[PDB]
Design a protein around this ligand. Structure first.
Ligand SMILES: NC(=O)c1ccc[n+]([C@@H]2O[C@H](COP(=O)([O-])OP(=O)(O)OC[C@H]3O[C@@H](n4cnc5c(N)ncnc54)[C@H](O)[C@@H]3O)[C@@H](O)[C@H]2O)c1
Ligand SMILES: NC(=O)c1ccc[n+]([C@@H]2O[C@H](COP(=O)([O-])OP(=O)(O)OC[C@H]3O[C@@H](n4cnc5c(N)ncnc54)[C@H](O)[C@@H]3O)[C@@H](O)[C@H]2O)c1
Ligand SMILES: O=c1ccn([C@@H]2O[C@H](COP(=O)(O)OP(=O)(O)O)[C@@H](O)[C@H]2O)c(=O)[nH]1
Ligand SMILES: O=c1ccn([C@@H]2O[C@H](COP(=O)(O)OP(=O)(O)O)[C@@H](O)[C@H]2O)c(=O)[nH]1
Lengths: 377, 370
């Protein structure tokens, strides 16, 4: 039974990018805590392999992998026509290659999604599209003088979905490739909801953290690769290397536990009358830190989880020219406004930053530690 | 005879897309009368260039779906893409068509220019900057007087748009993405390009007068809207009291800019350029007053009892309207690469433009009046 009070309709769900970080955890909750059927579309199924026929016949009947690449595949429209609800996670979303592969980024996050939107509207399906907190980009407050008191007024940093602005860098700041593409797909989805009647929901994750996020380089991902900060610092800790802090890690972020976030998504799935229409910030405003702090906190927790104590200097600064490359820029302080998601679905993140890091770093140590010891010799 | 870098001007075949538009039409007049270049005029409609079909070649083509485009591109040395829905009126009313127009439909053009090693001049907009960071500081806060917060420099000022529900930014966001893509294509592969950001170009064949040149219920850009208001002696509708600001440049001044870009690829390839006239700033109220004054001069007849009136943007534009508040173009970059500056005054350009408007539309609107 749902939030409205009505009983829960069971449904076939087409999940695109379902073998990803978010996808994989989403399948865990749908399978274990709901009646719904999942159609898992992705190019790779590595992260959901524990849930499939090869590994177990415990769920089969309610999940079905389909190796598909949505750039060119006729089978997609049928697969959509198969389900009642489409969830589109499929997207290049590591900042590393917003400024290095800008074309592939734009094509991934805007162009390749268009068909998905076409089919949902044509065949009268419901769509949940995953955008990003990067759509807000920078805070208004960031342009006031250093230590100007207006910075303290939440007016200038809290990111409300119905009224805060989308602020990006100039064009030459190619990192915004990603954000601009996400912005346009949102305007299009919203437009399609307006010009025709598309039932939709848009999700703006603020830095979701957990097991299975991205990859450790030189183990289950390219040696030359560069993931998102969780994975980057995870790698740094496992190899007993200091944590590289980009331009002194003074930007701020708010991390939410992956499990907390998935609860949110589920509520959206099961309450379409309160989610259709809306755009939703999913983040945990209470777990704010600078990147320096994330680093310190992670080394502390790691030392707890690992046994071993910390390094002489456990971090070090590095320029974004050195780290990210040429056209890097950065959001400075993401603080998600909760009013809309809180009013519509009653959601709140239960989990602490420290708690979530303990959890996540234990998974990381359990998984990667022997492997990284064997790849040092 | 000669470019800025001193070299001679080799003649060129120019593929002009959206060539029968406002800007296109004036661009053709200039290329024809003042340069050796050959023009291929692609548009669906040729009304505004029909006077020039007595070195130019119309091709009734719709770039959404048309195979002959790639050959037409492969024909020329330089492509200029003006083709774009660009009246604010239907950013919030036809958002899908806007996005498809300003982003999706342009992609092929970009494909062909990069594949076949042609040079591209893409027309974006000052709307890409959107709102001024100054606009978010408190009413009458002094930091608003610091140019730091309103001058729009192309290499560093930010793109600030409204939230998603403010559907007017459909247009701006699409233009933003096409710019990032063009620039990306210039980076990931070697595309020779230039991007143009017009700040409110004003002149003769801009848009249409409703009930004469176009639909009666239609809604163009402010020049045409007020032109109609004056011609019919109605008051000028001021949207939420017309307190937003703009900077108008004379169409003739602007075309000179474009020409320099055409003939100096050495200085224009790579760059993005503000083309506007920072000296001709006014609020919309002021544009209205100034236009009624000039009109009275040009027409003979004097003004009316109340020559303007306020109207809400709910009433005027519809549901998801929002607005840029203060466009002031920077110009360091254009001024230092092409040496361009707008000669022409606002008053002067309005005198000129309103005389053209009166000459053209006044007997036609007297006929249709009765
Ligand atoms: N994790 C976060 O903190 C975070 C933050 C902001 C936004 N997001 C957004 O959430 C969504 C999911 O991100 P994630 O964390 O699961 O990343 P992820 O990369 O783990 O998930 C994306 C999955 O989509 C798949 N995919 C990409 N292109 C594809 C194609 N053509 N065909 C089939 N599959 C394809 C990938 O193979 C991958 O498994 C993205 O849209 C992202 O923009 C995530
Ligand atoms: N007029 C201004 O002051 C101003 C301000 C900012 C930006 N711009 C930009 O400059 C460019 C031109 O502006 P304009 O005032 O000439 O607009 P316009 O509408 O007068 O000209 C655009 C032309 O492109 C044509 N076109 C549209 N779709 C087409 C298609 N599928 N195939 C062929 N032709 C098509 C139109 O029919 C029209 O003739 C646009 O890209 C606009 O965004 C202009
Ligand atoms: O090894 C790293 C990885 C990331 N960052 C920074 O930490 C923040 C989080 O970046 P991430 O790549 O996780 O994505 P973002 O939040 O920028 O979308 C950003 O300010 C990055 O510049 C860092 O200093 N070192
Ligand atoms: O009849 C009109 C037409 C336009 N405007 C306003 O004048 C400005 C210019 O709008 P336009 O459509 O010319 O182009 P924009 O600068 O909005 O791209 C905007 O503030 C409009 O809201 C107005 O008050 N009355």
């Amino acid at each position: 039974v749902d939030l409205d009070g009505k009983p829960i309709q069971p449904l076939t769900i087409c999940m695109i990018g379902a073998g990803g970080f978010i996808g994989s955890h989403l399948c865990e909750k749908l399978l274990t805590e709901t009646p719904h059927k999942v159609l898992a579309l992705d190019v790779y199924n590595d992260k959901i392999k524990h849930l499939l026929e090869p590994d177990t016949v415990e769920w089969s009947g309610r999940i079905q992998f389909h190796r598909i690449n949505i750039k060119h595949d006729s089978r997609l429209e049928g697969l959509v026509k198969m389900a009642d609800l489409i969830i589109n996670l499929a997207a290049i979303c590591t900042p590393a290659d917003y400024n290095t592969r800008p074309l592939d980024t734009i094509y991934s996050n805007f162009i390749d999604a268009l068909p998905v939107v076409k089919y949902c509207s044509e065949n009268n399906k419901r769509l949940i599209h995953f955008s990003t907190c990067e759509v807000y980009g920078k805070t208004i407050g960031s342009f006031l003088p250093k230590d100007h008191p207006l910075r303290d007024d939440p007016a200038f940093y809290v990111l409300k979905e119905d009224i805060s602005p989308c602020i990006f860098g100039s064009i030459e700041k190619q990192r915004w490739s990603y954000a601009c593409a996400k912005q346009l797909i949102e305007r299009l989805v919203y437009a399609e909801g307006a010009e025709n009647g598309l039932e939709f929901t848009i999700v703006r994750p603020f830095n979701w953290i957990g097991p299975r996020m991205d990859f450790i380089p030189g183990i289950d991902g390219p040696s030359e690769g560069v993931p998102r900060v969780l994975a980057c610092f995870s790698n740094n800790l496992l190899r007993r290397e200091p944590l590289k802090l980009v331009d002194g890690g003074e930007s701020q972020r708010t991390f939410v536990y992956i499990n907390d976030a998935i609860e949110a998504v589920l509520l959206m799935i099961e309450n379409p009358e309160r989610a259709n229409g809306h755009i939703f910030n999913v983040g945990n405003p209470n777990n704010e830190v600078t990147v320096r702090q994330l680093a310190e906190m992670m080394t502390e927790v790691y030392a707890k989880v690992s046994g071993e104590g910390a390094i002489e200097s456990p971090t070090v600064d590095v320029s974004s020219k050195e780290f990210y490359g040429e056209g890097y820029d950065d959001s400075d302080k993401r603080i998600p406004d909760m009013t809309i998601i809180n009013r519509q679905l009653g959601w709140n993140p239960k989990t602490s930053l420290w708690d979530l890091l303990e959890s996540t770093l234990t998974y990381q140590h359990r998984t990667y530690a022997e492997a990284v010891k064997k790849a040092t010799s």
